[PDB]
Every structure is written in C-alpha cells, then in structure tokens.
Amino acid sequence: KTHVQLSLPVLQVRDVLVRGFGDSVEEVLSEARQHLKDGTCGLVEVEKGVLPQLEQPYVFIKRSDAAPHGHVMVELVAELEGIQYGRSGETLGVLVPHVGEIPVAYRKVLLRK
Ligand SMILES: O=C1NCCN[C@H]1c1ccc(O)cc1
C-alpha cells in the first residue's frame, strides 16, 4: 500500500534514550522508515528547547494533505545544518527510535511510504 495507518507513541524529549536515527540524511530516512515498519518509532512534539536536545540529522513528520479514520496524512522530511530534504506541510513532530520509553499520548497518522 502507498499509505499505512500507524499509532505513534508520543515521548517526552528528556525520556528519549536514543536521540536520533544516524549520521546522514539518507541513513536517518532509511532507519526512520524501518522503525515505522517494525513498530519501534516514537514521536517528540516540537516546542522551544526540544530540537537542541536531539541529534541531527532530524527526521520530521509533516502534514501532506488536509484526515482519514482520524489518521492525519504525513510524510517524512529530514533536516541537517538548516537544509531540509523534502517539501511538505506543518510539523507534527520529530521521529526517534522507541526502546520502551513510556509515552504521554499516541498520535494516529496515515504515513505516505
Ligand atoms: O509502518 C508500517 N506498518 C505496517 C507495515 N508497513 C509499514 C511501512 C513500510 C515501509 C515504509 O517505508 C514505512 C512503513
């Protein structure tokens, strides 16, 4: 399928044990997609002070359209040293590996893949 319905655990930035997916734009998009498939991907909501606490390159989920079955349609956009790879809508948050941190909420998304 071109899209998959996912329910992403929303993590507090200070709970995150692995603060990024790797070392290059291509690796972090690859790893983020693999973790989304395997159900081991969390979401951190972006506010003041969050991004400097996470590791670049960043993988964002961004709104791709204006929301089937309660799932907002999203796509992946990576960022490194102020350059974004991808063009999309409003940021829903930054993806990180999930290694068993307790979430504060779940975010339902329809991931374009
Ligand atoms: O996340 C998923 N859940 C169910 C099966 N498919 C996936 C998936 C496949 C490929 C991707 O690139 C990203 C996600």
Please give the resolution of this entry in Å, rounded to 1 decimal: 1.6
Distance CA 25, CA 37 (A): 19
Instruction: Tell me the fold of 4-111.
Output: SH3 type barrels. (2.30.30)
Q: Does any ligand 1 atom lie closer than 6 A to the CB of residue 6?
A: yes
Name the pairing type of β-strands 105-111 and 4-10: antiparallel
* 31 CA → ligand 1 middle, Å: 12
Whether the CA torsion 94, 100, 105, 111 is positive or negative: it is: positive
Q: Which residues contact 83 (CB under 8 A, 6 or more apart)?
A: none
Report how far ligand 1's centroid is from the alpha carbon of 113 (Å). Answer: 7
Q: How far is the CA of 41 from the centre of ligand 1 (A)?
A: 11
**What residues does each domain of the chain span?**
4-111
Instruction: Please tell me the experimental approach by which this structure was elucidated.
Output: X-ray
Q: SS3 of 111, please?
A: strand
